[PDB]
């Protein structure tokens, strides 16, 4: 089997996690791209790395891969806070201002000493 070496794999992983956008589906541009950005000592190894970056540009255009890309990581930096609801489920208007509370928790409310808009609901089994 022609399993590629780990240096070519790791160099392609670094150059695609950091230098994504100028690499494309054409190997011939990627050859002098990795010439102009990377100092690789031999023509054979830089051909290996440029062909592997071409192949990872081939399958990256169909979907996301487990490795790091920037243009997704801004997006899960506003995924943390962009979907704040104006009214949550914990607000009063989703139950018309009066809570759906059984008799025992209303006994907790009247025993602890607080005033609260509760509707007693009778539940069994």
């Amino acid at each position: 089997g022609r399993v590629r070496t780990k240096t070519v794999k790791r160099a392609s992983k670094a150059l695609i996690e950091r230098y994504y956008p100028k690499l494309t589906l054409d190997f011939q541009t990627n050859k002098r791209l990795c010439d102009e950005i990377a100092t690789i000592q031999s023509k054979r190894l830089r051909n290996k790395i440029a062909g592997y970056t071409t192949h990872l540009m081939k399958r990256i255009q169909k979907g996301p891969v487990r490795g790091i890309s920037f243009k997704l990581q801004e997006e899960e930096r506003e995924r943390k806070d962009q979907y704040v609801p104006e009214v949550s489920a914990l607000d009063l208007s989703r139950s018309n201002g009066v809570l759906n509370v059984d008799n025992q928790t209303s006994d907790l409310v009247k025993s602890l000493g607080l005033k609260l808009p509760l509707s007693v609901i009778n539940v069994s089994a």
């Binding site: 494309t24 054409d26 011939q28 002098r32």
Partner: protein, 317 residues
């Protein structure tokens, strides 16, 4: 009432990516193609609904693949740019190389001749735009680009060359450079791009600059006023641009298809996406070169699957 571009045939003679197309003004039948099969192939075209006639010549003199080609006003000389650090001037009838331009330390992307066939530039990714004559003497070496020079062009003069030889170059450092070739210094800089600019072209009157690249921003500069007019969005990456010689149409070679924009009125005319067999949606071939004909009715188009397509302007209901 619409002007509809309909595919009428194919042109297969290449083994590499057709990276340039050149049209002639002396005759309208000649199409010169620079491709990545290390050769250049000229064509006389017999207009039919499925095929075209004669695979005329093969111009093999280049050690590596060939990037750019251009034609003269008469249409007798072929001027090629390739990756063998040289440029070559050909004869389109037989294929004799008159002279080889040797000044570049790296590989060449673009070449353009002037209107009087005396003034030759050369665009290469060695951060150097070199100036050549017909006999092949490098009389200037223009520096200033901090990254690759993807494309160079010669601006058409509007007042019959009133002592202002102007050329324009779109670098790969998100910046466009325009030179005045009477005293060989930088004239104007067009700042405002965000990615690498694959191409640029000049309007037929010589006042508009259309530059686009990976970001999909076809930024329209006014060269006569030396300012930035407006921005057109073309979404994906754009490889080649060409202006219509008669109409105000601006057609782009995008990664999804060929998007034809209109400057007056501002609307998108057509989105040419040819049919493909046996390829996925992430595997469809894209356009890297296009050229308008001498009458503005025939739109040539070169792709990456060794096939040159054509499109003609008709009038619909």
């Amino acid at each position: 009432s619409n002007e509809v571009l309909v595919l009428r045939g194919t042109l297969e003679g290449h083994n590499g990516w057709v990276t340039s197309l050149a049209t002639s003004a002396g005759q309208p039948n000649l199409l010169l193609s620079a491709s990545r099969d290390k050769t250049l192939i000229s064509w006389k075209l017999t207009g039919d609904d499925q095929k075209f006639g004669v695979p005329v010549r093969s111009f093999k003199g280049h050690s590596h693949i060939v990037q750019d080609c251009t034609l003269t006003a008469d249409g007798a000389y072929a001027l090629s740019a390739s990756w063998d650090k040289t440029l070559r001037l050909w004869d389109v009838a037989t294929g004799e190389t008159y002279q080889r331009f040797v000044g570049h330390k790296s590989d060449v992307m673009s070449v353009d001749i002037d209107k009087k066939a005396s003034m030759i530039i050369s665009g290469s990714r060695d951060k150097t735009i070199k100036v050549w004559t017909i006999k092949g003497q490098c009389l200037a070496t223009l520096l200033g680009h901090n990254d690759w020079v993807s494309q160079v062009r010669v601006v058409p003069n509007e007042k019959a060359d009133d002592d202002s030889v102007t050329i324009i170059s779109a670098g790969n450092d998100k910046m466009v450079k325009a030179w005045n070739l009477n005293q060989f210094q930088i004239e104007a800089d067009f700042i405002g791009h965000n990615s690498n600019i694959n191409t640029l072209t000049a309007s037929p009157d010589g006042t508009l600059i259309a530059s686009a690249g990976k970001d999909g921003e076809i930024m329209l500069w006014n060269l006569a006023a030396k300012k930035a007019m407006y921005t057109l969005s073309a979404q994906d990456e754009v490889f080649s641009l060409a202006f219509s010689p008669n109409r105000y149409w601006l057609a782009a070679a995008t990664a999804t298809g060929i998007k034809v924009f209109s400057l007056d009125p501002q609307y998108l005319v057509d989105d040419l996406r040819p049919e493909f067999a046996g390829y996925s949606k992430a595997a469809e071939p894209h356009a890297v070169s296009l050229a308008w004909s001498a009458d503005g009715q025939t739109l040539f188009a070169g792709y990456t699957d060794n096939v040159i397509r054509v499109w003609q302007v008709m009038t619909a209901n």
